[PDB]
Write a protein that binds this ligand. Structure first.
Ligand SMILES: *C/C=C1/C(=C/c2[nH]c(/C=C3[NH+]=C(/C=C4/NC(=O)C(C=C)=C4C)C(C)=C\3CCC(=O)O)c(CCC(=O)O)c2C)NC(=O)[C@H]1C
Ligand SMILES: *C/C=C1/C(=C/c2[nH]c(/C=C3[NH+]=C(/C=C4/NC(=O)C(C=C)=C4C)C(C)=C\3CCC(=O)O)c(CCC(=O)O)c2C)NC(=O)[C@H]1C
Lengths: 507, 491
């Protein structure tokens, strides 16, 4: 209908600052209660109480829990809440009015948030053996990529979900799918990149503050919270930590377009930062039991530490190689005995791997020796003069188009440069080149992954992979090695001062 | 007196004990050596005559169904379908009115099977693992991680004492964390020599995750026959849960006051980082579920230690650069300027005394030797000519270095290639200074033996520690070599 689309257009237009932390509604697979701290006085209740527990929500507000959940259950819950910090609380599978309810408790804004999750009747030794199997398989991962596919495949084996993907968030937000174990007759999303605008900052904060996000129904009607605002606090309700939180209609539409209806994502956090996400998707809606989502919560913590451990080892492994090859070039520089830059020119292949690049252009006056994928010599000549205007010793930039506007015709080859030139008056230098990230990636309406990929393409124009701290350190230290050898040649020019006394002696 | 003569023989020769080939298995189980074709019994445990009521001499050389059962032999053959016996689940069995747990592995082309006996007399287990993972995730400092891990393991398995040992650079073991029941001798901070854990034991713990000894006062059961007919050489038990421990370690545990032990190996980068050793005063057996619970902890905890340490390696090395560039900036403004701020020099590499030796005078800062003998120390290193000299055992190669071993046992000095003898020397203290603790195989003797074996050895200079010294000399070299060109500019 025309009325329905009008609200969607406003919501879709303004999605970066949509207050998803205060949805004002919850998913229909649970009941939400706000309880006052001293006497468990009900502040606001989800309108689902009419459907289950058979109580009109108008007069339910302001009364004790005993009025709806019974005296004994309310006493048990009050005893559990007081002086417990609501951390690692054992599951309380209560049963009121013939409906099984799993009770999850937390607190926010000096109030108690109580979630009663309905357990389907149709829906431990086996689970324990599975956890050990997963721990063994994850520990056996020799490489990071092997860890990715092993983890994705075995999560699919555990949960039976029709798709499991792992997104890794790069430096500027953009996420990339790095592993996938999908059910037959489904799309292949491996290698796809999506823009950082696809996930808002509020969503990133919510994923960092939680571990599991479960959306059992994409085609779900949001049950509102009556009253919308808290009576005592005179404000909205904070549902950041609430499992029963309304998802934005934009994301529901996006999930429907992809073909998924039930989703479950496990956050991956390293050092207080969101490394990525483990997205599990299904076609037929399904509800994940407490045992299943307690196991997958433990999966994320194991993976987050394991990924962090291998990331540091890879950093150390490459850094040791950087210092190993840095000494090798220094030895080549000293024993070259031909020119300051000739020794580097003798091994162009080794020069690239020192920093990580695709082409180098070692320059000595009027001779622009270029190796690997590189622009035409005139542009390399042109690019050199721009950096000497600044006078900086080492200049690293992964976005040449936005700092050097004429560096656009060759942005497909030289999108990030790293140049080191000794301060001697004559021209000099070694310039490294990196390609656009968009060239490496190869992947097969709106609110679809196909549209997301194109938006990433138009935003990643002229951006190369960032120069790592080791890469800049490698260039900076090579400058010291070149400078140390350059001043040695200045010592060798004392032979001129040796002959100066010789032709003065004859006089 | 017969045991005393035999026991003392083994004590002298401990580094060559064939612990991988004991020939005996612990009484809490029966081990059968099986052949793939039709499940022929190669070797059978001695206690099969008691628990199973079959003659060990007669039971050798027939089908496993005779002692186990036709259906049980069938299911064993089914699960052991040449599938590497890695992902085998639990196969609870009941033969002759007793309950068994089946373990399978393959050594020297076999199908060796272990039947573990459990005592006749869930949601919390999954919740315990979740709480354990959450608690380690919440930890930030390494010491906090050790404390919380030890406390959590002690709560989970119920053992009276739990300790974490870490193996240092040389090989000696140091107890880092400990959480124990009251009225027992604390062992935190104690150091024991590498001789307590032989190389064979180190390799076996490297190739295993869990090593359990339920009863210390046990009589090993003899494997019969003692030679495999297909190899005529003792059965390889290096991957077997049921394995008789060396009596030296039995005596060690008895003297230390523990009768049940359960050690979880900690492996990082394929190397034995340490051990999580649990001990109980009363013989306490374990269940199948608890074996996997503590096994997973060692895998999880070893992952954090590798990650937490590597974060500290980077953090320490970044702080060096901030200190390194500070000196380089101070260098430009040939050695006198450095004497203004000597404090950051020690923090640059980790030290306690720094000596500046250029031209004639010498400056003594921090805990440093006497200037007279310091000058003698500088004279040696110039003969070698190395740009940097790294050594942690000065008395090992510098015999006069005995009068100031406590003051300085390890040195890291750099000198300039220019002819005039000028350089800077750093010092480290002995390790024994910072370690304090309260044939008599006791922890106290091991600390006494360690103190003897740790004389004159200081903390090893890390790769980053030497790298800072190599970089600092380049800062002095650049200024000196710049003035070398200035010497040309003079004329
Ligand atoms: C400006 C608003 C928009 C928006 C909002 C939004 N997105 C999410 C969650 C997403 N969206 C993802 C986008 C994708 N990009 C891809 O390439 C694919 C599939 C291959 C997807 C699905 C994405 C990965 C997530 C995280 C999901 C997860 O696994 O956790 C949210 C959060 C909603 C919530 O309640 O958590 C919001 C608000 N989406 C848009 O497309 C733009 C218009
Ligand atoms: C020269 C050989 C000897 C020997 C053999 C031996 N020891 C072990 C196992 C040990 N021993 C440990 C020693 C300790 N040092 C201490 O300071 C403390 C306590 C404060 C102890 C217990 C030690 C920690 C282990 C590992 C225990 C574990 O369960 O992993 C073995 C291995 C036995 C095996 O079956 O694997 C051997 C062969 N011990 C000696 O003391 C000397 C004489």
């Amino acid at each position: 209908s025309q009325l329905d689309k009008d609200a969607f257009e406003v919501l879709l237009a303004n999605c970066a600052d949509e207050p998803i932390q205060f949805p004002g509604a919850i998913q229909p697979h649970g009941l939400l209660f706000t309880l006052k701290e001293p006497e468990l006085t009900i502040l606001q209740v989800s309108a689902n109480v009419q459907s289950v527990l058979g109580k009109v929500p108008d007069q339910l507000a302001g009364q004790t829990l005993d009025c709806v959940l019974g005296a004994g259950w309310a006493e048990v819950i009050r005893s559990t809440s007081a002086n417990d910090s609501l951390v690692d609380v054992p599951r309380l599978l209560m049963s009121v009015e013939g409906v099984e309810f799993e009770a999850l408790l937390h607190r926010s804004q000096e109030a108690l948030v109580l979630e009663l999750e309905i357990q389907d009747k149709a829906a431990y030794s086996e689970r324990t053996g599975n956890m050990g199997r997963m721990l063994r398989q994850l520990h056996a991962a020799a490489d990071l990529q092997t860890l990715y596919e092993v983890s994705v495949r075995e999560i699919q084996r555990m949960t039976g979900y029709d798709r499991v993907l792992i997104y890794r968030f790069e430096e500027e937000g953009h996420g990339q799918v790095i592993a996938e174990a999908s059910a037959p007759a489904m799309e292949l999303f491996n290698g796809l990149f999506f823009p950082a605008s696809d996930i808002p900052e509020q969503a990133r904060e919510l994923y960092r503050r939680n571990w599991l996000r479960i959306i059992p129904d994409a085609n779900y009607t949001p049950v509102p919270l009556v009253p919308q605002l808290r009576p005592d606090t005179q404000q909205q309700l904070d549902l950041s930590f609430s499992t029963l939180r309304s998802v934005s209609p934009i994301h529901c539409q996006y999930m429907k377009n992809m073909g998924v209806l039930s989703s479950m994502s496990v956050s991956l956090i390293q050092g207080g930062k969101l490394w990525g996400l483990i997205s599990c998707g299904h076609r037929t809606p399904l509800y994940v039991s407490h045992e299943l989502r307690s196991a997958c919560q433990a999966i994320g913590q194991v993976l987050s530490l394991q990924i962090s451990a291998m990331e540091a080892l890879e950093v150390s492994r490459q850094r040791e190689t950087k210092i190993q090859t840095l000494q090798q070039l220094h030895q080549m520089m000293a024993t070259s005995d031909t020119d300051v830059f000739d020794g580097l020119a003798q091994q162009p292949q080794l020069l690239m791997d020192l920093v990580g690049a695709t082409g180098v252009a070692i320059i000595e006056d009027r001779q622009t020796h270029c190796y690997g994928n590189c622009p035409e010599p005139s542009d390399i000549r042109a690019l050199h003069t721009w950096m000497m205007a600044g006078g900086e010793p080492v200049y690293a930039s992964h976005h040449l188009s936005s700092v050097y506007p004429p560096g656009e015709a060759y942005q497909t080859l030289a999108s990030g440069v790293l140049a080191m030139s000794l301060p001697k008056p004559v021209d000099n230098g070694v310039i490294w080149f990196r390609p656009e990230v968009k060239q490496s990636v190869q992947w097969s309406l709106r609110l679809q992954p196909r549209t997301s990929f194109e938006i990433w393409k138009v935003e990643m124009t002229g951006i190369a992979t960032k120069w790592s701290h080791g890469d800049v350190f490698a260039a900076n230290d090579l400058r010291r090695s070149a400078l140390e050898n350059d001043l040695a040649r200045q010592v060798s020019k004392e032979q001129q001062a040796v002959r100066a006394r010789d032709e003065l002696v004859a006089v």
